[PDB]
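Hey,

Quick one before I head out. I ran the complex with sodium ion overnight. Inputs first:
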Amino acid sequence: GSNPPPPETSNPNKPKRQTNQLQYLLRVVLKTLWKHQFAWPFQQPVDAVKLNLPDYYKIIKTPMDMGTIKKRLENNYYWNAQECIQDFNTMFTNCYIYNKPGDDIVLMAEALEKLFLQKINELPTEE
Ligand SMILES: COc1ccc(Br)cc1S(=O)(=O)Nc1cc2c(C)noc2cc1C
Ligand code: NA
């Protein structure tokens, strides 16, 4: 099999803006997760060829990863924080759907998600 094209990170036609919440999502939330020991499987799109996962994109039709999120935040791709939060949720959910409870990778996703939710509790109010 082949890999699909990765998710877009800019789109002229998609409404986009900067908000202080989205700034916080990049500067604090993404940065804290990116540097965590458990970040490595989630720092780029799943490469189903190199990782030998020929069923991955048979099961997962809405892929998402932190590399894509980082680029989207750097490009001010989002209209609001909720759109960015939804991308993180998709990334975690995909891991839980494709794998099994207790799997090494699921336990890592669960730890990152816990940290994510802690950091998102301190999301400042919007301007
Ligand atoms: C067998 O490959 C493993 C085993 C344990 C861990 Br933790 C990670 C891998 S892997 O080489 O990153 N392959 C892999 C990646 C993902 C991603 C991303 N989402 O679900 C996955 C499942 C596997 C096996
Ligand atoms: Na599952």
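Helices lie at 20-34, 56-59, 66-74, 81-98, 104-121.

Talk tomorrow,
K.
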